[PDB]
Design a protein around this ligand. Structure first.
Ligand code: CL
Ligand code: ZN
Length: 364
């Protein structure tokens, strides 16, 4: 009853060139590290011989199979030597979630090194597990958040701007969903209530996006790191992570989940579809005119979708939209954390209204 719980990664390290202090961070755990790395990252981001420069920590480097599946988690787990002191994940979301799962299975600390700032999952005590074919299988709730999250903003700036923008879409949802949970007194990912700190970090996330998002996008377009980019990477990773996990999820992510039932949306990134969920949720939950205008203006300036056509649903049928709404309103979905009672028809209507509003702003 009214008890809060806020969870955190142990250490969050961020800056241009931070990959160069990875050895120092691993050495705080011991002398043996098991590294799970994305193949593209090994060859094109760190360089195949990157670990040859280590002198204080012995690395067992293993190329990630590509899918965070129970099968891959089992395969990698069997390659870990007993004397291993720390597990490391370097790459995108699936690589990081796999590393978290392997560390959990072997009861070892984990260091998470995202090479893109495209979702707010890095700092979380969660791994999303898929079948070998890439279809969602289940959520693995972890007992501990990562011991270290290390973000090299120079590596992030060299990745395509599309990925930073998608991270801003995943982050954009944080305040709206956490605010709904705060109003509802809904539980967060721990089962207890969010703290004043969690809700304040979710609001800071949103304010940071509005103020620095465009400046950060201009920086990444030139593969450059500026303080504006640093603030947005921190917002997309640390603030958004804490805000969604300890503040809570609500309509936007449930709507994103419903959108996955339409195959035309599969080529779009998580954060791009979350943005559509956010916009629909502003109509659904009765936001005032100035707030709706503020969010659409932000999406327009950074290049997030504001219409169904922009996520591959140009001319989508009412029948297809109702499938999305029904999926979003599954009894176990987060949309029920909204203070208002929500039915599928309400979501269907909000998606259509949000789309029409976005199209008219764009003179379509
Ligand atoms: Cl989020
Ligand atoms: Zn998300």
């Amino acid at each position: 009853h009214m008890i809060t719980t806020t969870i955190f990664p142990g250490r969050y390290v961020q800056g241009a060139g931070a990959i160069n202090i990875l050895e120092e961070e691993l050495s705080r755990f011991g002398e043996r590290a098991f590294v799970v790395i994305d193949d593209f990252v090994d060859k094109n981001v760190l360089g195949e011989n990157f670990f040859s420069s280590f002198t204080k920590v012995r690395v067992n480097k293993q190329i990630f199979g590509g899918e965070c599946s129970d099968e891959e988690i089992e395969r990698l787990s069997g390659l870990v030597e007993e004397e291993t002191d720390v597990v490391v994940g370097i790459g995108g979301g699936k690589t990081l979630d796999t590393a978290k799962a392997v560390a959990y299975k072997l009861k070892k600390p984990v260091v998470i090194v995202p090479t893109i700032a495209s979702t707010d999952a890095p700092c979380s005590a969660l791994s999303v597990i898929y079948t070998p074919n890439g279809e969602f299988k289940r959520y693995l709730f972890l007992p501990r958040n990562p011991d270290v999250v290390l973000v090299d903003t120079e590596i992030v700036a060299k990745a395509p701007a599309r990925f930073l923008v998608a991270g801003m879409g995943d982050a954009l949802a944080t305040w709206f969903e956490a605010e709904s949970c705060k109003q509802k007194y809904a539980p967060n990912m721990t089962g207890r209530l969010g703290s004043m700190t969690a809700y304040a970090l979710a609001r800071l996330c949103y304010e940071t996006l509005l103020e620095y998002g465009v400046l950060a996008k201009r920086s990444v377009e030139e593969k450059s790191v500026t303080p504006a980019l640093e603030k947005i990477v921190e917002a997309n990773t640390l603030l958004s992570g804490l805000g969604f996990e300890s503040g809570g999820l609500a309509a936007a992510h449930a709507i994103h989940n419903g959108l996955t039932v339409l195959e035309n949306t599969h080529k779009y990134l998580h954060g791009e579809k979350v943005a559509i969920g956010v916009l629909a949720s502003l109509f659904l939950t009765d936001k005032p005119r100035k707030m709706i205008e503020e969010v659409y203006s932000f999406c327009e300036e950074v290049g997030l979708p504001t219409t169904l056509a922009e996520i591959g649903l140009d001319g989508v049928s009412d029948e297809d939209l109702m499938k999305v709404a029904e999926k979003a309103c599954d009894k176990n979905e987060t949309i029920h954390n909204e203070p208002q009672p929500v039915t599928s028809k309400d979501v269907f209507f909000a998606l259509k209204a949000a789309d029409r509003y976005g199209r008219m702003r764009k003179n379509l």
